[PDB]
Design an enzyme around this catalytic site. Structure first.
Site, PDB file in Angstrom:
ATOM      1  N   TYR A 312       0.862  -1.206   0.000  1.00 49.10           N
ATOM      2  CA  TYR A 312       0.000   0.000   0.000  1.00 49.10           C
ATOM      3  C   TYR A 312       0.894   1.251   0.000  1.00 49.10           C
ATOM      4  CZ  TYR A 312      -4.135  -2.814   1.020  1.00 49.10           C
ATOM      5  OH  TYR A 312      -5.125  -3.736   0.943  1.00 49.10           O
ATOM      6  N   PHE A 315       1.968   1.984  -3.454  1.00 50.22           N
ATOM      7  CA  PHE A 315       0.821   2.537  -4.205  1.00 50.22           C
ATOM      8  C   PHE A 315       0.703   4.038  -3.919  1.00 50.22           C
ATOM      9  CE2 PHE A 315      -2.042  -1.517  -4.426  1.00 50.22           C
ATOM     10  CZ  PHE A 315      -1.018  -2.154  -5.113  1.00 50.22           C
ATOM     11  N   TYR A 322      -3.063  10.498  -7.546  1.00 49.86           N
ATOM     12  CA  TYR A 322      -4.167  10.839  -6.624  1.00 49.86           C
ATOM     13  C   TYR A 322      -4.627  12.275  -6.907  1.00 49.86           C
ATOM     14  CZ  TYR A 322      -3.044   6.357  -4.562  1.00 49.86           C
ATOM     15  OH  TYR A 322      -2.889   5.015  -4.433  1.00 49.86           O
ATOM     16  N   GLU A 380     -13.455  -1.723   2.466  1.00 51.22           N
ATOM     17  CA  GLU A 380     -12.156  -2.422   2.392  1.00 51.22           C
ATOM     18  C   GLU A 380     -12.310  -3.804   3.025  1.00 51.22           C
ATOM     19  OE1 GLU A 380      -9.053  -1.909   0.785  1.00 51.22           O
ATOM     20  OE2 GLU A 380      -9.294  -3.978   1.557  1.00 51.22           O
ATOM     21  N   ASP A 407     -16.436  -7.004   1.823  1.00 54.41           N
ATOM     22  CA  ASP A 407     -16.410  -7.194   0.382  1.00 54.41           C
ATOM     23  C   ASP A 407     -17.535  -6.345  -0.210  1.00 54.41           C
ATOM     24  OD1 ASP A 407     -16.793  -8.272  -2.298  1.00 54.41           O
ATOM     25  OD2 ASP A 407     -15.359  -9.814  -1.636  1.00 54.41           O
ATOM     26  N   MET A 408     -17.224  -5.506  -1.199  1.00 58.67           N
ATOM     27  CA  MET A 408     -18.237  -4.609  -1.803  1.00 58.67           C
ATOM     28  C   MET A 408     -19.321  -5.440  -2.501  1.00 58.67           C
ATOM     29  SD  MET A 408     -16.157  -3.145  -5.103  1.00 58.67           S
ATOM     30  CE  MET A 408     -14.603  -2.929  -4.218  1.00 58.67           C
ATOM     31  N   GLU A 423      -9.638   2.017  -7.078  1.00 64.06           N
ATOM     32  CA  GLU A 423      -8.316   1.773  -7.717  1.00 64.06           C
ATOM     33  C   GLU A 423      -8.118   0.257  -7.714  1.00 64.06           C
ATOM     34  OE1 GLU A 423      -5.950   3.410  -3.628  1.00 64.06           O
ATOM     35  OE2 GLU A 423      -4.985   3.640  -5.606  1.00 64.06           O
ATOM     36  N   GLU A 432      -7.218  -7.502 -12.048  1.00 64.23           N
ATOM     37  CA  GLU A 432      -7.501  -7.652 -10.600  1.00 64.23           C
ATOM     38  C   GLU A 432      -9.006  -7.853 -10.416  1.00 64.23           C
ATOM     39  OE1 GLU A 432      -5.735  -4.433  -8.388  1.00 64.23           O
ATOM     40  OE2 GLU A 432      -3.717  -4.885  -9.139  1.00 64.23           O
TER      41      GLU A 432
HETATM   42  C1  LIG Z   1      -5.924   0.088  -2.941  1.00 68.71           C
HETATM   43  S1  LIG Z   1      -5.668  -1.313  -3.913  1.00 68.71           S
HETATM   44  C2  LIG Z   1      -7.293  -1.985  -4.161  1.00 68.71           C
HETATM   45  C3  LIG Z   1      -8.021  -2.299  -2.796  1.00 68.71           C
HETATM   46  O1  LIG Z   1      -9.305  -2.893  -2.992  1.00 68.71           O
HETATM   47  C4  LIG Z   1      -9.517  -3.932  -2.036  1.00 68.71           C
HETATM   48  N1  LIG Z   1     -10.478  -4.802  -2.674  1.00 68.71           N
HETATM   49  C5  LIG Z   1     -10.303  -5.514  -3.785  1.00 68.71           C
HETATM   50  N2  LIG Z   1     -11.466  -6.152  -4.068  1.00 68.71           N
HETATM   51  C6  LIG Z   1     -12.357  -5.837  -3.118  1.00 68.71           C
HETATM   52  C7  LIG Z   1     -13.744  -6.120  -2.854  1.00 68.71           C
HETATM   53  N3  LIG Z   1     -14.424  -6.930  -3.680  1.00 68.71           N
HETATM   54  N4  LIG Z   1     -14.330  -5.596  -1.787  1.00 68.71           N
HETATM   55  C8  LIG Z   1     -13.630  -4.792  -0.963  1.00 68.71           C
HETATM   56  N5  LIG Z   1     -12.339  -4.475  -1.158  1.00 68.71           N
HETATM   57  C9  LIG Z   1     -11.688  -4.954  -2.204  1.00 68.71           C
HETATM   58  C10 LIG Z   1      -8.178  -4.516  -1.825  1.00 68.71           C
HETATM   59  O2  LIG Z   1      -8.103  -5.233  -0.585  1.00 68.71           O
HETATM   60  C11 LIG Z   1      -7.267  -3.263  -1.952  1.00 68.71           C
HETATM   61  O3  LIG Z   1      -6.971  -2.711  -0.661  1.00 68.71           O
END
Ligand SMILES: CSC[C@H]1O[C@@H](n2cnc3c(N)ncnc32)[C@H](O)[C@@H]1O
Ligand SMILES: CSC[C@H]1O[C@@H](n2cnc3c(N)ncnc32)[C@H](O)[C@@H]1O
Lengths: 625, 310, 625, 310
Positions: A312, A315, A322, A380, A407-408, A423, A432
């Site tokens: 991180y 990044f 940013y 996150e 998880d989103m 991102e 990804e």
């Molecule tokens: C900042 S790099 C991208 C970020 O997204 C998070 N990420 C990736 N996929 C998901 C998801 N489906 N739900 C929540 N966070 C995610 C990763 O853990 C990472 O910190």
């Protein structure tokens, strides 16, 4: 600055000679290990029984000197491909003898000529030496840009030089190299000592060597011009090639006698140092990309895996990216809240994959900049990063930011979003699984909601690099398919390579994705016109993304975002190199394939020849969902 | 041993050249061991050679001696491993050998030297692929020719024409040169492209006939007039390193090979004599001016052999 | 005799249809597993939600019937390479569905068309099905000799058929196949169903298919002529192709309606059976070579290894070869003992490698035939075979034969030999080290002694066989180099192959070997002119030997000794197949290499492209000394 | 249900053709389940269809029905999955349907049939790539043409010229045929090579204009006279399976797609009407002779739909 050696074919005393060249500033000496004229008989009496010693003693230098300062040379009488059988046999025996001595001595490298087209038996004998004890030492194949037959003065009355230009013919020296290294099965121990002449050939001839394992450049004193003060110097075209070769960090070798006899031989070296210090310096990227050149890396999978703190941190180390994000949100906010509604309005902004909060901070700087009101969700799934987030939010953000540890795709949001920011992009954009993640989140975006980014596109280009073909090949592991190395992508600062064609778009995604039925699977066919003779070894991948309207990010070289050193391209290897003739088209086929469990890429070349389909059903490489 | 004369002659005997008076010029290299150099020796008594103590004069060269030639009666022109062509001059008393000049013009070992019919000019050949023409009195290069595409094995000046010389190379070319032609070189030889040419000797009387030896031990007689390959014999089991004509009215031809043998052939290329005397590579031959039936060979076995030819 | 199936695209009742075709004498039925017209939608409502069943029940036949009598067919609407995306997606889904059903059913085979040039996505989908559960079942790619575009009636006024002959063009159908199987990485499950038309193309077009994995030949009823009694029959040229295909033991498939409606459909089958029974029968060799066709075997090493009883028994099972030996000795005896000296003379004959004594017996029959006197030594290092010898000598030979239990290189013989006789030759002549063995024995041969054999010569020829390339590739083993399979020779009755060029001599040995200094090492360069388009997969090896004067043995096809069924040729594979265009030369390089311990071969192709050197320093394959 | 009439009509409705009197001809296939066959039905009351009990006549075919056409008023010509073209004849009482002939001439499924303007001849198209011309009275093949290089999708006879018919194939060819030409076929269509042609309909009055549908749902109007692609509309989200002109003086054009939709277009190819009535593939359309504003569609959903067009 410059690593440089002296080439000599005359060493009366190894002691004085080595000392002399050191005094002159040379890092090492190329010399014979047997007297170049001391032809040896192995089969026929009486010369076979010649009393020894057969050469001078190992005792004449330290082991350390032999290990570091001395590059050996094959005696010039040694002709393993001679049409004369007795010469072929004595040359096979002598070559083994001299190579065995260099290995006895622990020489770091050994010079062998490619001075004609047929070096089959020479390759057979070198391969044998290599397959006799695993050793580290390099073999430098001395090849000229221009074959001596094509360099000869036009002074033979009844044998005029051909003034008819032959595209392929002028490239004959590369084919000498290619055939040799193919016969020796791309040994990593076998590299190119490229010999440069007074007359450079066509650029196309120089370009032939782009992705080849060049360890050394040989500059004859002959090719050097004389300045008004009588110092040795080079043509601008010679100088341009030196600048090219400095980027490949080759060792320069000075061969021949002092032709600037008004002055010392350090004058040649002094010139090279002068060119080194006076090269155009490297950008921030080039200082970033410092030790990463052609270093193969696993692509990060931040969905399937939880990134480490320092991942991180890297990044975050690129502020420009940013600032771009801040600008996209700033713009989007002004487009959505009229100045009349600034204080009534308050937009719900959700950062989907918030990591340690740089997009959270950019979103906040954007709202104060726009003088508009935002509520923030920071989503996150990496609970280690949630720790960083929750300390930030307690200590600094306060209740404006609601950190969500989820998880989103699973999260049941308390309200719908005006703007989702993310991102979730790799070096090949969708690698990804940004598509699958944002698809799963879009049910909680308002009907007029904006995703930043709104779009991204992957790009491919065919590349030549025998160097990277060998790096990949070297990644065989036990307990897996012996060719799995070739059926997976690598993130890499591609350095020693040739891009054979302009990049072409591969896969594109848009957010929100309106499709009533959504398929993130893809099948793309690309045609790359190629204007050179070459060998295809793989495909470079890049991406572009539209954050918002005109604000973009790119690692595609033609459209590369400034400061985005954070972020090397990707490489898709192929198992077998493919010869491409000038004027031919490379046709590559790429698929993006999926299960409920895994997403993967499969790829095949269908022109000018067919490859195998690479990574069928993700057998070698998958991305976790 | 003389003043300025080394205690010890290097083992590898490279060259043997009798002067008009019958005095013997010796070139030697150190081709193994710690120090890789060479020496120039004068033996007014040829039968004492190679013994250093019984020498008229001797000197040490910085590097090995690939080739040698008398320049008149007091001059010695040297092909050095160093890329130098060096001019060495005999003493008034001829008791010591002194360097007149040493010029580092060749980018690799100087393999071969010949003095042109004038005696004021010489041609050098090198592993660097260049052939150079030398102004001996001004000690400079008049011309440098990259005609060949591989290392130059031999250069041999015409007996009587100061502008004419042969060269041969591992590019499988025999070149006939005339510096009076704007394109000075001309490619000559057999009907068949054959084995690499290794050795060259002009006929002493017949200004348009020469002989060449090959890497397969074949000796060939060539007429520029016919540009046809007249006569060839398989004289050696290995490379023909050297070819030397007798001083006779109808000359005999001495043939020396890495097969460690010497042969003497008639003008029809038939074999009169054969000597297995040497037990290493046979490097040179010089017929005695005094007795034309006497022929001295030198070898890497350090043997100076005196042959009586039938 | 003939295995044959019926192809149908109409099956009202699977029960009656199968019964009908059985009654007609067909071994199996090719039919659709879904109704060929029943196009299915997978993405778009409402047709996506079409109520089922999607096809007829597995319950309608026994598992055994499904396993043995039924070949499935891909529905003809399924077009995975369609330029229309929605058709491509529905076709990807349908293809998987139908393949998954065939696998559900346990079908032994499944027919898929190659009916155009681009089958990339079809290959990608089939590869996926193959990489989903390891299964045995075959995929028969239905390809025509002649593309339908090149078969069409010349009846379009403004689109005339090209009457200009195009060598490469007429071969376009093979390239469809090649590209498909290359993309599917030579799966062993993927084979050719070759469809034959009324108009056969040029022989060159038929020859293209020589070494290809043909499992089935499809004969349309259309291509059949009518005899005076109105029975279906074939042109002589069609018949010649059937005879060719019977040798490859393919299954014949009859497609189309009864066009001989004066008679039943068994009439077509009856014709094939008629051709089978009336083929020219196979020679003793072909009856010998019965189950060995393309069976890869390790070359015997009778020096390093002790042969088993049954190995010697097979060597002995060919009497003709020993009659040849008897004849050579007979002749040599008469040349050495004048009729005046018959009773004074007695020659010392030594059998060097006597095995179980067939050369001992031949030597004895030869002496009684010549009416000349011989003393015999039988030398044999295999102590198991010495047991057989010593029982023979005690019971039958008596003291005329002295059995020696020793290596002929170590043995101190009591007296020198007039004649040494040996059978130390493999399929590549010197591959059992006859040279090294006889060299070691020659010190005990009289100055005027004869070796029988006096000479032998190995021969090579370039060959095409995708079939044998796949057999070799399949010989990967754990605990070794994953490509060692390709760096060793195999003894094999080469069957499904194309010899691309006349055999050329490779290595020759002579006995006694007079060379003052002897080297059994070899380096040979061969140039094979090739007059066809093809793929090089390896090199067939053969040998000839001169026993004595005109008496020889050969497995070289042009000079093949009669009755020498005992004795298949050798194969040298290459790792990567090499494309050869008509008029190109294949240049191969072979080395015979040695230590005190081991002898081996190394080989490389240098034209029209370079291979890797195979078996460097015997890393994959050596012969023990 | 009538005598010789099946208890149950197969689910997949392939063809709907009104006779001059307004009686309805129905073709159906069984495309799934145990038995893969077909049926021919006559409904003198079109509104009772598809119900089998209320049918004027019905019969069972050995195999499925890919295509159908009225032959005059008592004749039914059938494209069978079996590779047969079969002639079926109506009864005097028209109470049962009887096979006149069944000829197995096609090596694969017969995909398409059309009756030529004479009424004594028909053209068949098949997945076997052949197009055949039939003598209906002698029940034989006059001609068999392999013009195409892939499966034949459609054959459509000219309204008024007994020698003229269109064909289209997955070889991406539209062929205009005239059996009076020694080379009978001629390749016609748009400027651009485009999406595979799927459906064909001649203009009823204009003997040199036709329309074709493609696999991408585009409908196109073509003038042989211009040999130019006049007008094209994107009418469907999927393949255009069929194209039928209204009996009107200025005809309306019915468009049916695998998108399960029907569209009715003006002569400018603009859209008047759209019906989502079917919930599976729309297979045919026949305008009522009696009321020219009435149009019957059939689908694989087994729905017989009667549309009133504005
Ligand atoms: C900042 S790099 C991208 C970020 O997204 C998070 N990420 C990736 N996929 C998901 C998801 N489906 N739900 C929540 N966070 C995610 C990763 O853990 C990472 O910190
Ligand atoms: C009959 S097949 C050849 C025979 O020769 C024997 N053989 C091979 N090499 C030697 C050898 N060097 N000395 C003795 N017998 C040998 C083998 O054991 C075999 O029986």
């Amino acid at each position: 600055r410059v690593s440089s050696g002296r080439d000599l074919n005359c060493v009366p005393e190894i002691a004085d000679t080595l000392g002399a060249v050191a005094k002159q500033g040379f890092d090492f000496l190329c010399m014979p290990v047997f007297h170049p004229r001391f032809k040896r008989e192995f089969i026929q009496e009486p010369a076979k029984n010649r009393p020894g010693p057969q050469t001078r003693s190992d005792l004449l230098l330290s082991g350390r000197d032999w290990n570091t300062l001395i590059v050996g040379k094959l005696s010039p009488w040694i002709r393993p491909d001679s049409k004369v059988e007795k010469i072929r046999r004595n040359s096979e025996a002598a070559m083994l003898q001299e190579l065995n001595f260099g290995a006895y001595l622990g020489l770091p490298a050994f010079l062998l000529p490619l001075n004609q087209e047929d070096n089959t038996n020479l390759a057979r004998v070198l391969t044998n030496h290599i397959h006799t004890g695993h050793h580290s030492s390099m073999f430098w194949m001395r090849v000229p840009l221009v074959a001596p037959e094509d360099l000869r003065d036009d002074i033979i009355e009844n044998a005029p030089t051909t003034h008819t230009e032959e595209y392929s013919g002028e490239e004959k020296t590369w084919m000498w190299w290619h055939n040799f290294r193919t016969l020796c099965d791309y040994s990593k121990r076998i590299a190119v000592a490229l010999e440069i002449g007074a007359d450079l050939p066509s650029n196309h001839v120089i370009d032939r060597w782009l992705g080849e394992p060049i360890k050394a450049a040989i500059l004859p004193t002959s090719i050097f011009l004389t300045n008004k003060k009588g110092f040795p110097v080079l043509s601008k075209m010679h100088q341009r090639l030196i600048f090219r070769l400095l980027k490949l960090e080759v060792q320069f070798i000075i061969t021949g006698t002092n032709h600037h006899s008004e002055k010392e031989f350090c004058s040649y070296l002094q010139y090279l140092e002068y060119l080194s210090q006076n090269r155009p310096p490297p950008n921030a990227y080039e200082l970033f990309a410092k030790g990463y050149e052609d270093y193969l890396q696993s692509p990060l999978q931040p969905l399937m895996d939880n990134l480490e703190s320092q991942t991180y941190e890297v990044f975050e180390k690129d502020p420009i990216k940013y600032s771009q994000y801040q600008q996209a949100i700033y713009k989007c906010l002004l487009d959505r809240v009229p100045e009349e509604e600034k204080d009534t309005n308050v937009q719900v902004l959700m950062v989907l994959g918030a990591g340690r909060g740089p997009l959270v901070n950019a979103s906040l700087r954007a709202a104060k900049q726009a003088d508009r009101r935002i509520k923030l969700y920071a989503v996150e799934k990496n609970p280690n990063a949630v720790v960083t987030l929750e300390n930030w939010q307690f200590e600094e953000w306060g209740s404006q930011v609601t950190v969500v540890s989820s998880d989103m795709r699973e999260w049941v949001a308390p309200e719908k979003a005006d703007i989702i920011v993310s991102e979730l992009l790799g070096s090949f954009a969708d690698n990804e699984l940004s598509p699958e993640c944002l698809d799963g989140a879009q049910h909680f975006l308002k009907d007029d909601g904006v995703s930043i980014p709104g779009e991204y596109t992957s790009f491919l280009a065919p590349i030549s690099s025998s160097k990277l073909y060998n790096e990949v090949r070297a990644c065989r592991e036990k307990d897996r398919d012996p060719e799995a190395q070739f059926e997976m992508p690598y993130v890499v600062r591609l350095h020693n390579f040739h891009q054979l064609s302009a990049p072409q778009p591969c896969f594109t995604f848009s957010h929100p994705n309106r499709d009533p039925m959504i398929d993130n699977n893809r099948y793309c066919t690309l045609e790359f016109p190629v204007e050179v003779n070459t060998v295809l070894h793989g495909f470079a991948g890049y991406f572009e993304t539209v954050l918002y309207q005109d604000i973009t990010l790119s690692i595609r070289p033609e459209t590369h975002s400034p400061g985005m050193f954070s972020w090397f391209p990707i490489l898709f290897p192929i198992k077998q190199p493919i010869t491409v003739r000038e004027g031919q088209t490379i046709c590559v086929r790429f698929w993006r394939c999926s299960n409920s469990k895994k997403v993967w890429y499969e790829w095949a070349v269908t022109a000018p020849v067919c490859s195998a389909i690479h990574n069928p059903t993700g057998r070698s490489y998958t991305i976790g969902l | 041993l003389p003043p300025n004369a080394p205690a010890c002659m290097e083992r590898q005997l490279e060259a043997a050249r009798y002067r008009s008076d019958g005095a013997l010029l010796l070139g030697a290299s150190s081709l193994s061991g710690r120090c890789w150099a060479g020496s120039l020796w004068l033996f007014k008594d040829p039968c004492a050679a190679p013994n250093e103590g019984f020498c008229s004069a001797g000197v040490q060269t910085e590097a090995g001696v690939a080739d040698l030639t008398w320049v008149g009666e007091r001059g010695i022109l040297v092909a050095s491993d160093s890329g130098a062509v060096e001019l060495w001059e005999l003493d008034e008393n001829e008791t010591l050998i002194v360097s007149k000049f040493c010029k580092y013009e060749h980018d690799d070992i100087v393999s071969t030297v010949s003095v042109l019919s004038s005696g004021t000019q010489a041609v050098s050949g090198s592993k660097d692929i260049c052939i150079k023409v030398w102004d001996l009195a001004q000690q400079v290069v008049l011309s440098s020719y990259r005609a060949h595409a591989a290392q130059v094995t031999c250069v041999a000046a015409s007996p009587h024409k100061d502008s004419v010389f042969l060269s041969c190379s591992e590019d499988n070319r025999i070149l006939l040169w005339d510096t009076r032609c704007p394109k000075p070189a001309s490619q000559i030889g057999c009907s068949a492209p054959g084995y690499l040419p290794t050795s060259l000797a002009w006929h002493p009387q017949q200004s348009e006939v020469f002989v060449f030896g090959d890497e397969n031990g074949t000796v060939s007689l060539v007429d520029t007039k016919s540009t046809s390959c007249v006569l060839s014999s398989a004289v050696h089991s290995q490379c023909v390193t050297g070819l030397v004509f007798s001083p006779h009215s109808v000359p005999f031809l001495a043939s020396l090979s890495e097969d460690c043998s010497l042969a003497v052939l008639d003008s029809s290329l038939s074999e009169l004599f054969r000597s297995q005397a040497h037990r290493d590579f046979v490097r040179d031959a010089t017929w005695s001016p005094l007795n034309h039936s006497l022929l001295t060979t030198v070898g890497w076995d350090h043997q100076v052999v005196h042959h009586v030819v039938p």
